[PDB]
Ligand SMILES: Nc1nc2c(ncn2[C@@H]2O[C@H](COP(=O)(O)OP(=O)(O)O)[C@@H](O)[C@H]2O)c(=O)[nH]1
């Protein structure tokens with residue numbers, strides 16, 4: 579990793595418990611943590627991927643519990659060129675709160691940010707509370723990419739991040 583052509587900062591946002599921290603770990607180091615306690619703070623991790631023979635350092639940010647800390651929250655969004663809004667396919671509240679997250683993006687992130695919607699925990703299909711076609715339509719109406727993922731079993735995680743990175747690449 580001596581060099582890279584671009585660095586794309588991407589923020590993960592969404593309700594607590596949906597799997598953001600595990601999406602970060604699954605994508606960056608192929609790791610998953612079954613632990614149900616949220617870490618209060620901010621972190622980032624990187625992975626380099628290739629798009630059209632260009633090396634892109636994807637710098638993936640994750641946070642919890644700092645919403646009342648203004649400067650840190652500002653720093654969280656600062657410079658982000660992509661965002662993934664994450665809900666839990668088994669928890670309708672997390673999906674219904676996606677409009678809040680879109681609004682947070684509009685109010686805190688740069689105008690040009692490329693956005694993907696992720697319905698995580700697809701392995702909990704027996705507990706599904708959000709129909710795929712409904713969420714897919716909501717994503718389209720709001721100019722968001724859409725993927726259902728399982729951070730737990732890995733399903734579609736690389737796809738969700740890659741598609742967004744390709745989309746960021748086309749814009750810039
Ligand atoms: N079944 C299932 N559990 C998951 C998945 N992703 C995360 N979890 C679990 O859901 C809980 C919340 O995950 P976490 O990544 O901390 O969510 P966050 O609060 O959005 O950062 C933890 O117990 C995780 O192990 C998934 O895809 N499937």
Ligand SMILES: [Mg+2]
Pocket residue numbers: 598599600616617640641642
């Ligand atoms: Mg977390």
